[PDB]
Amino acid sequence: FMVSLPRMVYPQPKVLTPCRKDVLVVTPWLAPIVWEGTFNIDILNEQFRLQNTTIGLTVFAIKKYVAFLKLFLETAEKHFMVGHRVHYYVFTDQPAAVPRVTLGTGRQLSVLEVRAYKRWQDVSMRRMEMISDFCERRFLSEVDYLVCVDVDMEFRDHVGVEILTPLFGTLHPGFYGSSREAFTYERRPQSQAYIPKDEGDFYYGGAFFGGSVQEVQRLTRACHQAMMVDQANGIEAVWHDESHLNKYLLRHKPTKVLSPEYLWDQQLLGWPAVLRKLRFTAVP
Amino acid sequence: FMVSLPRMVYPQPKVLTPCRKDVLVVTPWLAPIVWEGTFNIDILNEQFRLQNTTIGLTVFAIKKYVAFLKLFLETAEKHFMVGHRVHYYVFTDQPAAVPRVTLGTGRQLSVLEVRAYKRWQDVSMRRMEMISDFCERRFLSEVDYLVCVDVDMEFRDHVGVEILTPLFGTLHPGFYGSSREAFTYERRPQSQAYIPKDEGDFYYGGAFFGGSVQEVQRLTRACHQAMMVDQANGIEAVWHDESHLNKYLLRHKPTKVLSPEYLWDQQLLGWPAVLRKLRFTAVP
Ligand SMILES: O=c1ccn([C@@H]2O[C@H](COP(=O)(O)O)[C@@H](O)[C@H]2O)c(=O)[nH]1
Ligand SMILES: O=c1ccn([C@@H]2O[C@H](COP(=O)(O)O)[C@@H](O)[C@H]2O)c(=O)[nH]1
Ligand SMILES: [Mn+2]
Ligand SMILES: [Mn+2]
Nearest to A32 among B4, B30, B40 (CB): B30
Q: Is B76 annotated as a binding residue?
A: no
- Determine the residue among A23, A29, A161 to mutate to test chain B binding: the one whose Cβ has the most chain B Cβ atoms within 10 Å: A29
User: Which residue has the least CA distance to atom 7 on ligand 1?
Assistant: A124
Overall size of chain A counted in residues = 284
Q: How far apart are CA B81 and CA B159, in angstroms?
A: 6
CATH number of the structural domain A1-284: 3.90.550.10
Listed in order, strand segments (DSSP E) in chain B are: 33-34, 54-61, 85-92, 107-113, 145-149, 153-155, 167-170, 208-212, 256-258, 280-282
Nearest to B80, CA basis, from B208, B267, B246: B208
Q: Is B199 within 8 Å of chain A by CB? A: yes
- Determine the residue among B27, B30, B170 to mutate to test chain A binding: the one whose Cβ has the most chain A Cβ atoms within 10 Å: B30
Nearest to A16 among B10, B43, B177 (CB): B177
Q: How far apart are CA B49 and CA B83, in angstroms?
A: 8
User: Which residue has the least CA distance to atom 19 on ligand 2?
Assistant: B62
Say how many C-beta atoms besides its own lie within 10 A of residue A56's C-beta.
24
Nearest to A13 among B27, B39, B256 (CB): B27
H helical segments located in B21-68: 41-50
Q: Which residues of B127-139 are buried (b: 16+ CB within 10 A; e: fewer)?
A: bbbbbbbbbeebb
Q: Is B136 noted as a catalytic residue in this protein? A: no
Judge whether B113 and B93 are in contact, CB under 8 Å. Answer: yes
| β partners of residue A85 | A54
Q: Is A176 annotated as a binding residue?
A: no
Judge whether B111 and B98 are in contact, CB under 8 Å. Answer: yes
Contacts (Cβ under 8 Å, ≥6 apart) of A260: A170, A171, A172, A173, A176, A275
Q: How many beta-carbon pairs under 8 angstroms link A with B?
A: 143
Nearest to A193, CA basis, from A151, A172, A224, A153: A224
Judge whether A143 and A58 are in contact, CB under 8 Å. Answer: no
**Hey, are the CB atoms on A15 and B202 less than 8 Å from each other?**
yes
**Hey, are the CB atoms on B14 and A30 less than 8 Å from each other?**
no
Q: How far apart are CA B177 and CA B227, in angstroms?
A: 28
Overall size of chain B counted in residues = 284
At position A4, the amino acid (one-letter code) is S
User: Which residue has the least CA distance to atom 1 on ligand 1?
Assistant: A120
Q: Which residues of A254-284 are buried (b: 16+ CB within 10 A; e: fewer)?
A: bbbbbbbbbbbbeeebeeeebbbbbbbbbee
Instruction: Assess whether the C-beta atom of B245 lies below 6 angstroms from ligand 2.
Output: no
Nearest to B200, CA basis, from B134, B272, B250: B250
**Residues around the ion ligand 4 (C-beta < 5 A):** B 152
Say how many C-beta atoms besides its own lie within 10 A of residue A113's C-beta.
10
Helix, strand and coil percent figures for chain B, each rounded to 5:
35, 20, 45
Contacts (Cβ under 8 Å, ≥6 apart) of B189: none
**Hey, are the CB atoms on A14 and B20 less than 8 Å from each other?**
no
Instruction: Assess whether the C-beta atom of B63 lies below 6 angstroms from ligand 2.
Output: yes
Element (H, E) at A110: strand A107-113
Q: How far apart are CA A280 and CA A158, in angstroms?
A: 9
Which ligand has its closest atom nearest to the C-alpha of A120? 1
The residues of A annotated as belonging to the active site are 242
Q: Which of residues 10-29 of A touch B (CB under 8 A)?
A: 10, 12-29
Instruction: Assess whether the C-beta atom of B150 lies below 6 angstroms from ligand 2.
Output: yes
Judge whether B23 and B33 are in contact, CB under 8 Å. Answer: yes
